[PDB]
Amino acid sequence: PKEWIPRPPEKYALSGHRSPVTRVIFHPVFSVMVSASEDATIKVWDYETGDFERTLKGHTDSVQDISFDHSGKLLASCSADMTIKLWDFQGFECIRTMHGHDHNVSSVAIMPNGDHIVSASRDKTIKMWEVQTGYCVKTFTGHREWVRMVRPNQDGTLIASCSNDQTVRVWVVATKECKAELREHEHVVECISWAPESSYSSISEATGKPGPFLLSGSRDKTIKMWDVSTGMCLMTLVGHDNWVRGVLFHSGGKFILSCADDKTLRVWDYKNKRCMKTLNAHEHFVTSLDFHKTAPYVVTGSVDQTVKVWECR
Numbered sequence: 001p002k003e004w005i006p007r008p009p010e011k012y013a014l015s016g017h018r019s020p021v022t023r024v025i026f027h028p029v030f031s032v033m034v035s036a037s038e039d040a041t042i043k044v045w046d047y048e049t050g051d052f053e054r055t056l057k058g059h060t061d062s063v064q065d066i067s068f069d070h071s072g073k074l075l076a077s078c079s080a081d082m083t084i085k086l087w088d089f090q091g092f093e094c095i096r097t098m099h100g101h102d103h104n105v106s107s108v109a110i111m112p113n114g115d116h117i118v119s120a121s122r123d124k125t126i127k128m129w130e131v132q133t134g135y136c137v138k139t140f141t142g143h144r145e146w147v148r149m150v151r152p153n154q155d156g157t158l159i160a161s162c163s164n165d166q167t168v169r170v171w172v173v174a175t176k177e178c179k180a181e182l183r184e185h186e187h188v189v190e191c192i193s194w195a196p197e198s199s200y201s202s203i204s205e206a207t208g209k210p211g212p213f214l215l216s217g218s219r220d221k222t223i224k225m226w227d228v229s230t231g232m233c234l235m236t237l238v239g240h241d242n243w244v245r246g247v248l249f250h251s252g253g254k255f256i257l258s259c260a261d262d263k264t265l266r267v268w269d270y271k272n273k274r275c276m277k278t279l280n281a282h283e284h285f286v287t288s289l290d291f292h293k294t295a296p297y298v299v300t301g302s303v304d305q306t307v308k309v310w311e312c313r
Contacts, residue, residue, distance in 0.1 A: 002198075002252025005267045006298040006310035008279050012050040014307040016043055021301030023065050023288045028072045033290065033299050035307045036063035042077055042087075047297055047309045056087055058094045065107045065149075069114040074131065076117050078105035084119050084129060098134040100127055107149045111173075112156040120147035126161055126171070140171050142178055153194050153212055158228070160214050162189035168216045170228050180226075184233045187220040191247050195225075198253030206271045207234055215256065217244030223258055225270065237268050239275035246289045257298065259286035265300055265310070281308060 019038035026033045031048040042056040042063055061080035068075055068089070075087040084098040084105060103122035110117050110131070117129040126147055128138035145164035152159050158179065162168045168182040168189055195203060195213035203213055203225070213234070214226045223237040223244055242261035249256055255276070256268040265281040268274070282302035289300045296312040 001294065001296075002250070002254055004296050004312035005250075005255060005277060006257075006265060006279060006312050008310075010281075010308040011297075011311045012047070012307075012309040014045050014050060014052065014309070015305065016052055017041065017305045017307075019062070020284075020303040020305060021287060021307055022063060024299040024301040024307055025066055025068065025290050026292050026297070026299065028068055028070070028293075030072065033307070033309075034066055034068075034075065035301055036066045036077060037305075038062040040079070040081075042066060042075070043307075045307060047292075047299060050309070054092055056092060056094075058085060058097075059083070064105060065109075067109045067117075069110040069131075070112060071114060074110060074114070076108045076110050078108035078119055080104045082121075084108055084117060086117070086131065086134070096134045098129050098136070100129075100136040101125065106147065107151075109151055111152050112154065118150050118152060118159055120150035120161055122146040124163075126150050126159065128173070138173075138176065140176055143167070143169065148189065149191050151192055151194060154197070158212070160192045160194065162192045162216055164188045168192055168214065168226065170214070180228050180231045182214075182216065182224075182226050182231060182233070184224060184236075185216060185218040185220050185222070187218050189216050189218045190243060190245055191217040193248045196249055196251065196253055198251065199249050200253070202254050202271060203234070206273075215247040215249070217247040217258060217260075219243040221260070223247050223256065223268070235270065235273050237270065237273065237275070239266060239268075239278075240264065242285075245285065245287050248289065248291055251291060251293045257289060257291055259289045259300055261285040263302075265289060265298070279310070281310075282306065
């Protein structure tokens with residue numbers, strides 16, 4: 001389970017979206033994954049059987065991001081319609097629509113404890129929302145441009161964000177203080193991902209409580225690994241031929257996976273600071289990926305309007 005990597009050809013290529021797929025995520029428990037699209041819909045699929053299950057309709061523009069709560073009974077989505085929606089993922093109904101952003105909401109995440117949602121917008125702000133009320137309880141200001149992605153760390157004490165202002169910021173959720181401003185990308189930063197604890201010994205081996213550690217992917221075509229405790233870039237992974245769109249760690253901690261506008265899914269052996277495998281994943285940009293925590297599956301989404309399921313071995 002700590003060594004398996006995606007292998008071509010894809011197990012499934014799933015069609016049905018009428019516009020680019022913007023985001024793909026696995027359910028935390030069920031054999032389903034969820035896609036968001038510029039067609040203003042969210043679709044649910046079984047990644048074991050390839051069966052289409054249902055469409056969640058209600059956004060009036062592009063759905064940009066999606067996030068499950070711990071329980072898997074709530075799904076948050078966000079949209080170019082400038083709203084966040086909370087969905088009952090049992091009854092498949094919109095519970096509430098949250099208003100407050102003044103432009104495109106590019107990113108959403110339900111915080112780990114499940115009591116709050118964090119969002120990031122082209123309006124240059126990050127907002128915190130109460131799940132129960134939909135009330136905006138916090139606005140994090142300081143990015144100089146469009147905030148493209150926001151992600152909490154494992155216990156929800158920190159959020160990381162990235163921006164058209166060419167920076168990654170780390171914020172303390174409780175105080176709103178900016179812990180780190182990471183500036184080494186000289187281009188728009190598209191994506192970020194926190195390192196899991198399973199990676200810490202491998203990151204120690206590669207460099208020779210630690211961290212925490214963060215990945216960023218940029219229009220400069222590189223992935224950077226950061227030590228949030230020192231503000232230092234530990235390594236830069238070179239190999240993508242176009243803008244990096246998604247990054248994450250293998251749940252086993254020993255590999256990084258990424259996807260990009262070069263139509264590839266890549267597996268990085270980061271101890272060797274090298275690209276170990278390139279998959280020709282899609283006929284157009286790969287906008288998004290997810291890695292199942294325990295099952296041998298990766299999912300990708302693309303401008304080619306498909307969701308692909310990759311078996312890992």
